[PDB]
Design a protein around this nucleic acid. Structure first.
Length: 239
RNA sequence: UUGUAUUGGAAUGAGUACAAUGUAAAUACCUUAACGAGGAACAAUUGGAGGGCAAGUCUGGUGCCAGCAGCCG
RNA sequence: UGAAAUUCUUGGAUUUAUUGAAGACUAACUACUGCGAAAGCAUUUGCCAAGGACGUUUUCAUUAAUCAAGAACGAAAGUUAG
RNA sequence: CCACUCGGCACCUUACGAGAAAUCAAAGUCUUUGGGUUCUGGGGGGAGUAUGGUCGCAAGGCUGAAACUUAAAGGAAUUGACAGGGCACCACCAGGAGUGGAGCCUGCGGCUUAAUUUGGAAACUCACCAGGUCCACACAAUAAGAUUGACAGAUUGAGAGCUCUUUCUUGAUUUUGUGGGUGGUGGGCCGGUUGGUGGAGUGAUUUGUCUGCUUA
RNA sequence: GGAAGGAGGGGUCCCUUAGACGUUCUGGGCCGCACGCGCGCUACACUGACGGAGCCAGCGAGUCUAACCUUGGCCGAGAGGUCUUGGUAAUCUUGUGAAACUCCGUCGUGCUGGGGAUAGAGCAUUGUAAUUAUUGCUCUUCAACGAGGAAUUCCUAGUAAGCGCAAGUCAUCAGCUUGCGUUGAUUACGUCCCUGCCCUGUAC
RNA sequence: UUUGGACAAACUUGGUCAUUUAGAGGAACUAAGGUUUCCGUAGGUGAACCUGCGGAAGGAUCAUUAAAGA
């Protein structure tokens, strides 16, 4: 792949004149083997896959498609330059959280705006109706929010569209913000209120929280103690 | 009176040769009896046809390779 | 200083006043002005010797031009001794 | 202060002239080529390097190559690619109705399958799948009977006087082998923009097409 | 001031030929579905559902070539059937007596009398043929859904949105496309913040 | 055969310079980011990029200034 890898590595030397293909790249055979493979937005995609193909053993199958990224043991690919930046932020952000006790999918690798992660077994929370032990489950979703607030971060949309099924795992973190943000409490109470609505409406439910614990549910000025300042490792928002 | 293709008589030395001439003796030249043209097989080559620099938008092959190219290519 | 730190200071820093010492430099006036072979030369007064231009009804009478060899001077930095 | 004159540092005007041009009182009086005299260059690198000499306390100065390598390196002057200001509900602002969440209809991708054709489908449409019938020219043999048409009935998963039981009708319109294929065969016609004459320049360029004030 | 200080018209010489880039019949598929993306229809109820009564449009299209659009009488719970009739159409169907809507009652906030998917039994209509089921009617069955995250579409006046009708295709078959009318708001009358387009130093 | 003399080929042993060749043995040795731009001199960094003193443009000039009859 060295005839292709160098063909990409020379691309940083900057349009592109025809002579760049003759003297910018490195000869007999080399000036022909590029065509022998080359004969069989897009190129920075269709060929740029080659890095993983070498460094990474099944091509798998299609699974999902989205407005800004596409999804195919699971691989994630972003959508000419900035796409490589976004992928790097995501990879290190996830990696960081997983090194703590947080229940998020394990990252395995990242290259050239491509990321690879563990594939979750479960099913989406939004269609759960019959879990055998809802009282403990309520408690443990509440405690999860407290942990993040301790470490310094607030999820923006911690709700049933991004939890999968303590057996739950959290599958994405769009537009997270730091605990220092001026609106931190306003978003915090939304997450608590959103999770209360679900357990009341569908499950009828209404040290820990809820029944059997001496405090009903968390509150922003309680149990938040600036433990770890992970919001400085990734400058999420609000310095 | 000028071109393009079926047909007919004429002319001649390359070569061979009696002789004489030539020469110290010879060979050859000059002269000459006999012989010696119809794919007149008694068959002209050496370099070129992008430009410099006279002369091909012809037809088949090949794969930046084999090669061409004083220089630009 | 863009921001700041090292530093100096209640035995008084920075700032104010009256005096003194040392070494260097010569503002404004100063310009489409001057002098010198070039490098270069700017406070006052004195001494020493030189120079161009101008004026000339003075003197000599070709004594001249350019120049290998050879010779004097030559910013700043640099070398040796006080 | 006014007029004149010699010498000097400069300036403005002028071009018989000069030059590749920028420009030039000399960079003029040069193919119409000769006033006197000193020094230096001969495409770009290697290289102000190596070596010898000479000067200096030293740092260094002066003099000064070749092997080899390369098609350009260089001068002057023209034209001109890839911040502002304007516009729009396929942009926003103020808002309305929403879509995205549920059930179902429908289009595309993927999966599956013998096929799920290709990119207002029950037959036909139809292009897809399984299984059945039926159908040139040029040489050698053949015929007055080469061949053509037709009642009633019949054969398969899918059938008919182009097959078959029975047997009439008709006449050279043609039949069986063997030799290259030629073609109702594949790969002729449509759907904001410039010059003339004049001016400048050796040219490529330039003016016209503008300093200022208006409009989509 | 004033009806109005407008809206629209790049494409079409070579090779190969016996049943050869064929003819035709029966049956199947195009409708299969763990899933991904997108345009839609119906709802989550009281500004409502159900029952009775009131009662109003505009743009189309229709047979002799034969059988199109159908009034009126009779039968049937209904879908539907049957005997006649007008129109080659500003003339007849047709005042297309459309729906939302208005008035008087029942229901009482309970996945309820909201919502009607999935499914069983039976009766009809088109067609040569309805099985994997065109469509219609009757009784029974009674699912999700308690106003919807990140994202994202259209829109400045008889306009958005609500409601229905006609035509197209068409033996039958619409939740589709185009047009028409009925009821009829809120919020700007601006800007370059976001998205996007356009115009006016240097040999690069 | 022999004395002396002039002419004078050439020989031997040391020194020195140059060259040919066998030939060690080794070193080899080679191949396969700046942002004004510069000159001389001295110092510094692995490294263009840094610092002291003197010099050049081969670097893009807006605006304003005196006026005469006893």
């Amino acid at each position: 792949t060295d005839d292709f890898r160098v063909l990409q590595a020379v691309e940083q030397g900057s349009v592109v004149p025809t002579p760049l293909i003759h003297q910018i790249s490195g000869s007999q055979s080399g000036t022909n083997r590029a065509i022998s493979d080359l004969a069989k937005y897009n190129g920075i995609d269709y060929l740029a896959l080659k890095t993983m193909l070498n460094r990474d053993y099944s091509v798998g199958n299609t699974i999902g498609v989205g407005k800004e990224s596409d999804i195919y043991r699971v691989m994630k690919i972003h959508r000419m330059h900035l796409s490589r930046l976004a992928a790097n932020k995501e990879y290190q952000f996830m990696s960081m959280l997983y090194s703590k006790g947080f229940k998020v999918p394990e990252p395995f690798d990242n290259s050239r705006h491509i990321v690879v992660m563990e594939l979750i077994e479960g099913y989406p929370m939004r269609r759960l109706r019959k879990h055998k032990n809802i009282p403990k489950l309520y408690s443990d979703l509440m405690c999860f929010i407290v942990d993040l607030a301790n470490s310094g971060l607030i999820h923006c949309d911690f709700n049933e569209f991004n939890i999968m099924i303590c057996g739950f795992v959290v599958i994405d973190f769009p537009q997270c913000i730091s605990i220092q943000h001026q609106d931190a409490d306003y978003y915090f109470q939304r997450d608590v209120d959103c999770i209360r609505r679900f357990f009341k409406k569908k499950l009828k439910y209404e040290e820990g929280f809820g029944d059997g614990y001496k405090y009903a549910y968390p509150d922003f000025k309680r149990d938040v103690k600036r433990t770890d300042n992970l919001d400085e490792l990734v400058q999420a928002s609000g310095f």
